[PDB]
Amino acid sequence: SHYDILQAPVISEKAYSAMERGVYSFWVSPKATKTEIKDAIQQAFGVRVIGISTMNVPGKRKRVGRFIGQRNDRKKAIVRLAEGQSIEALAGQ
Amino acid sequence: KPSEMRNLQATDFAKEIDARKKELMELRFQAAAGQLAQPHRVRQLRREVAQLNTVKAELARKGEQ
Amino acid sequence: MKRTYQPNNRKRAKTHGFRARMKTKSGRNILARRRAKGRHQLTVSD
Amino acid sequence: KHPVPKKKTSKSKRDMRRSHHALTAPNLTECPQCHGKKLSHHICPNCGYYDGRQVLA
RNA sequence: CGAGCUGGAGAUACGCUUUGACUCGGGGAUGUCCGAAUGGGGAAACCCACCUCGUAAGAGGUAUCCGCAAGGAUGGGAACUCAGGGAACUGAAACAUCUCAGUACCUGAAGGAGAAGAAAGAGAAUUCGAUUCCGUUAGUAGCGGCGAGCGAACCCGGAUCAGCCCAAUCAAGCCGAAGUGGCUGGAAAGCUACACCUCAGAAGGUGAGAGUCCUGUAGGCGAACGAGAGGUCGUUGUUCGUGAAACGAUGACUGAAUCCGCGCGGACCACCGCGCAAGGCUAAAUACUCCCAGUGACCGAUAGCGCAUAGUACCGUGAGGG
RNA sequence: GUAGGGGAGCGUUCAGUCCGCGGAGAAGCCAUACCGGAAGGAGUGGUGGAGCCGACUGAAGUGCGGAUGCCGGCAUGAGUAACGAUAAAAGAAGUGAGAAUCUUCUUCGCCGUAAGGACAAGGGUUCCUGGGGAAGGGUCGUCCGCCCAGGGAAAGUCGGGACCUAAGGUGAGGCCGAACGGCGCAGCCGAUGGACAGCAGGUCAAGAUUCCUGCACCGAUCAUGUGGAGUGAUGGAGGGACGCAUUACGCUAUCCAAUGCCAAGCUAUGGCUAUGCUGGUUGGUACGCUCAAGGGCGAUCGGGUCAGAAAAUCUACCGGUCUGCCUCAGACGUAUCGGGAGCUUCCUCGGAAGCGAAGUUGGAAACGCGACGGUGCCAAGAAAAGCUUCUAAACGU
Ligand SMILES: [K+]
Ligand SMILES: [K+]
Ligand SMILES: [Mg+2]
Ligand SMILES: [Mg+2]
Ligand SMILES: [Mg+2]
Ligand SMILES: [Mg+2]
Ligand SMILES: [Mg+2]
Ligand SMILES: [Mg+2]
Ligand SMILES: [Mg+2]
Ligand SMILES: [Mg+2]
Ligand SMILES: [Mg+2]
Ligand SMILES: [Mg+2]
Ligand SMILES: [Mg+2]
Ligand SMILES: [Mg+2]
Ligand SMILES: [Mg+2]
Ligand SMILES: [Mg+2]
Ligand SMILES: [Mg+2]
Ligand SMILES: [Mg+2]
Ligand SMILES: [Mg+2]
Ligand SMILES: [Mg+2]
Ligand SMILES: [Mg+2]
Ligand SMILES: [Mg+2]
Ligand SMILES: [Mg+2]
Ligand SMILES: [Mg+2]
Ligand SMILES: [Mg+2]
Ligand SMILES: [Mg+2]
Ligand SMILES: [Mg+2]
Ligand SMILES: [Mg+2]
Ligand SMILES: [Mg+2]
Ligand SMILES: [Mg+2]
Ligand SMILES: [Mg+2]
Ligand SMILES: [Mg+2]
Ligand SMILES: [Mg+2]
Ligand SMILES: [Mg+2]
Ligand code: NA
Ligand code: NA
Ligand code: NA
Ligand code: NA
Ligand code: NA
Ligand code: NA
Ligand code: NA
Ligand code: NA
Ligand code: NA
């Protein structure tokens, strides 16, 4: 369907501040090409997209113990909407 | 889940599916938003999706063999 | 003072690699012996 | 290594050697201003005087 | 099954549960990617396709070797079985045979077992009678630079015992007898005075030592339904190393008979005696053990598996070590 | 009394059996002046916090000072040698429980064909921000490339793939081998090469030819319009296509000079008073009959058969006939965009925002560019695709 594929919204000062200019950013499924992610992002907020760029992002951490870490392998996507901005109501966090 | 879930047609199944997945996505945004105060809701929906699919797939053998 | 060890991905993987192992039975045996004396971790994983 | 010792040394000897390692106790004075003990020909680290007061308290 | 549950996880929050939650068995439905990997490529878990069915998503198919089709197979297995190929150290107080040894390793094939198997036999009693394994024969007969050393079989006992077919009860689980007081104590299942059960005095836990407190054991019950030819030449096998050296087997040349027939019976011949190849299949008795239960004049952590978990950390390019 | 033989026993673990001990307390450990002919055994006390003596008998993983033994712990060398290039550092100020070592300031010193900068390979969060001070840091540490959390990485055109080929690897059929397997045409894989569409700037704490501001190029698909006609394979051919050495001409990046230009103020020490001092002094795109070195290029027709499998209007060969344009590195002019010494204001301590002057003359100038240059030499210097042209098949005029 459409509602899948994505993950969680990018929570940071740059994401939020770049949202002010109609630029959105959220995490998606690494194994997801840059078309179905466009189709999907569109058919969920009722908006077309012009700009699109995504990249992959590892992770590997740990606290104490002796159990090293593990790659968390993510992928952040950044979409740019046309003239009509402020999507739904989550564009003013 | 009992006979009050399979009573619906074939399309409505998919409907419930996508709807639940929608709400599930919402709660999911809240999760990373730091607002999710209903985990059992997540788990619940997770369960209901599996139920739907299971059932529907059960109607794949009963009536054709 | 070049040391013996000169890193290089396309080779550490080219030899010692999973498929490297598959091409000859004499490597298959290596895989088998590695999956046999308990859990292990091969050379495409490291 | 040419500089090797023949036998291990005895507790006794190895201690007799150390019979010259005792630190001297700092001979301390009483400061005539802030009644604190200080180091002769130095400045009282407490009140800061040395015939009138030089360093910042 | 009958109150709890919310995985090793120590914590917090939200919650699921008499419309029987979890848990314990037993069938289904979902199983991305890689891997025999099989669309193609590939430095595995990546990249690129085409076709078909289509509401986009998505699903399905697309390898090679035998067949009309169905179907089956190239994969993986610790040990065990058969087969192709096949050492050396070592021993002979040196070393060529011979031993080591058809050991180790390699490889192929297959199963829960294989091999072998229904007499052109063993054998010398005019006998036994598929094969295998165990005991014994016996360490005899015999082999051997006759040195080192190697080493059968028949008879008999026993485990198990069949010959038929071509060509011309164990897994869930439920049920399940019989104790109170006083005393030392922080706490008794101990001491003590009485009592009971006992087709149950195995065992574990419970503040300590435990028949009667708990879980259980004897015993009984127990489902929807899930399982049970010859010869010559080169050589070899068997105890058989060229020895008087048969016979089986095989590579290269040759090449017989079939009813007054053919092979064999330690060159060979006669007599005599046993047996009939060149077609196939075939439980059990046998081996081993990854896995499970039970048990131990087995360990109790410098032991016991390497590990009271880890093939991890750590070392190596790697096999590998640990 | 050594090798050696013989005899009688002690001790330890497990096992059977018997007598038992144990919370008012086992084993184990610790002390001790008692007992026995030895190995040893016992009493008492201390510690301990669960199990264990004695006797008899059976069985052994049964008695340690040694093996440059094995494992582990702890000593001696001793507060010794060292603290990792002889590019020294000093003061103030700040922070802090604590500063020679962290932060800031002003000096000093050292590299500067690097000890500066940018990439590939490789290492993988080491980057940025805010915390933390156990261990790492050869000293301290408030700091760090260490610990913790959070953030950050943006591509139609730059690298690679969806294109190509070399060595090499592989490889249906095929050629071979006790097994395993080894070889091998096409094909396919394989960048270290070929091919291929933009630059100039700004800006987060942390990204840029990726985000955006302006302007632009490429491919595909669709519509409209012009046009009125063929479009042309896995084919052929042309071409991609390849060296070393030396070297003419022009130009740029870039650099230097000045009494060119613009801006800022001040300059005492003795002087100068600005002909002094300091700093700056253009990038991309569009257009112009503007200036210019250099660079390489036959078209067309016709003929024959045996040439490119075949075929052709394409290619080679044979034959007739005869300066020029093409292309412009770069400079100049205009325009526009951006940049630019600095100035201005606020200041949560020092960043942000806003504004913005001129680009002159002369000289030098490469291993870059104009080009696939010229000349010389012997050792004689990849392939394939895209690209161009032209046929067949097929479809369509
Ligand atoms: K003056
Ligand atoms: K000047
Ligand atoms: Mg973009
Ligand atoms: Mg970390
Ligand atoms: Mg595949
Ligand atoms: Mg053989
Ligand atoms: Mg002989
Ligand atoms: Mg022989
Ligand atoms: Mg013969
Ligand atoms: Mg151990
Ligand atoms: Mg230990
Ligand atoms: Mg206790
Ligand atoms: Mg011993
Ligand atoms: Mg010793
Ligand atoms: Mg010595
Ligand atoms: Mg030691
Ligand atoms: Mg000293
Ligand atoms: Mg000394
Ligand atoms: Mg000294
Ligand atoms: Mg020193
Ligand atoms: Mg030194
Ligand atoms: Mg030094
Ligand atoms: Mg220093
Ligand atoms: Mg120099
Ligand atoms: Mg990286
Ligand atoms: Mg840092
Ligand atoms: Mg510290
Ligand atoms: Mg330190
Ligand atoms: Mg990208
Ligand atoms: Mg090959
Ligand atoms: Mg390259
Ligand atoms: Mg490219
Ligand atoms: Mg900034
Ligand atoms: Mg940077
Ligand atoms: Na239960
Ligand atoms: Na020998
Ligand atoms: Na094998
Ligand atoms: Na012979
Ligand atoms: Na211990
Ligand atoms: Na004693
Ligand atoms: Na390019
Ligand atoms: Na020149
Ligand atoms: Na003056």
From Swiss-Prot, chain A:
GO cellular component, one term: cytosolic large ribosomal subunit
GO molecular function: rRNA binding; structural constituent of ribosome
Signal peptide start and end residues: none
Keyword terms, alphabetized: Ribonucleoprotein, Ribosomal protein, RNA-binding, rRNA-binding
Gene Ontology BP term (one): translation
Family classification: Belongs to the universal ribosomal protein uL23 family.
Role of this protein: One of the early assembly protein it binds 23S rRNA. One of the proteins that surrounds the polypeptide exit tunnel on the outside of the subunit. Forms the main docking site for trigger factor binding to the ribosome.
This protein's name: Large ribosomal subunit protein uL23
Gene that encodes it: rplW
From Swiss-Prot, chain B:
Residues that span the membrane, as ranges: none
Ribosomal protein among keywords: yes
Coiled coil: none
Keywords on record: Ribonucleoprotein, Ribosomal protein, RNA-binding, rRNA-binding
Matching NCBIfam families: L29 (TIGR00012)
Role of this protein: Binds the 23S rRNA. One of the proteins that surrounds the polypeptide exit tunnel on the outside of the subunit.
Name of the protein in question: Large ribosomal subunit protein uL29
Source organism of the structure: Deinococcus radiodurans (strain ATCC 13939 / DSM 20539 / JCM 16871 / CCUG 27074 / LMG 4051 / NBRC 15346 / NCIMB 9279 / VKM B-1422 / R1)
UniProtKB/Swiss-Prot annotation, chain C:
Protein name: Large ribosomal subunit protein bL34
Subunit structure: Part of the 50S ribosomal subunit. Contacts protein L4.
Signal peptide feature range: none
Gene, per the UniProt record: rpmH
Family: Belongs to the bacterial ribosomal protein bL34 family.
InterPro entries: Ribosomal_bL34, Ribosomal_bL34_CS
Pfam families attached to this UniProt entry: Ribosomal_L34
Keywords: Ribonucleoprotein, Ribosomal protein, RNA-binding, rRNA-binding
PANTHER family registered for this protein in UniProt: LARGE RIBOSOMAL SUBUNIT PROTEIN BL34M, MITOCHONDRIAL RIBOSOMAL PROTEIN 34 FAMILY MEMBER
Protein origin, superkingdom: Bacteria
Role: Binds the 23S rRNA.
Gene Ontology molecular function: any one: rRNA binding
Key word Ribonucleoprotein present: yes
Annotated GO CC locations: ribonucleoprotein complex; ribosome
GO biological process: translation
UniProtKB/Swiss-Prot annotation, chain D:
Official protein name in the record: Large ribosomal subunit protein bL32
Binding site for Zn(2+): 31, 34, 44, 47
Region called Disordered, residue ranges: 1-32
Keywords attached to this entry: Metal-binding, Ribonucleoprotein, Ribosomal protein, RNA-binding, rRNA-binding, Zinc, Zinc-finger
Gene Ontology cellular-component terms listed: large ribosomal subunit
Organism encoding this protein: Deinococcus radiodurans (strain ATCC 13939 / DSM 20539 / JCM 16871 / CCUG 27074 / LMG 4051 / NBRC 15346 / NCIMB 9279 / VKM B-1422 / R1)
Family (UniProt): Belongs to the bacterial ribosomal protein bL32 family.
SUPFAM superfamilies, per database record: Zn-binding ribosomal proteins (SSF57829)
Reported cofactor(s): Zn(2+)
Cofactor note: Binds 1 zinc ion per subunit.
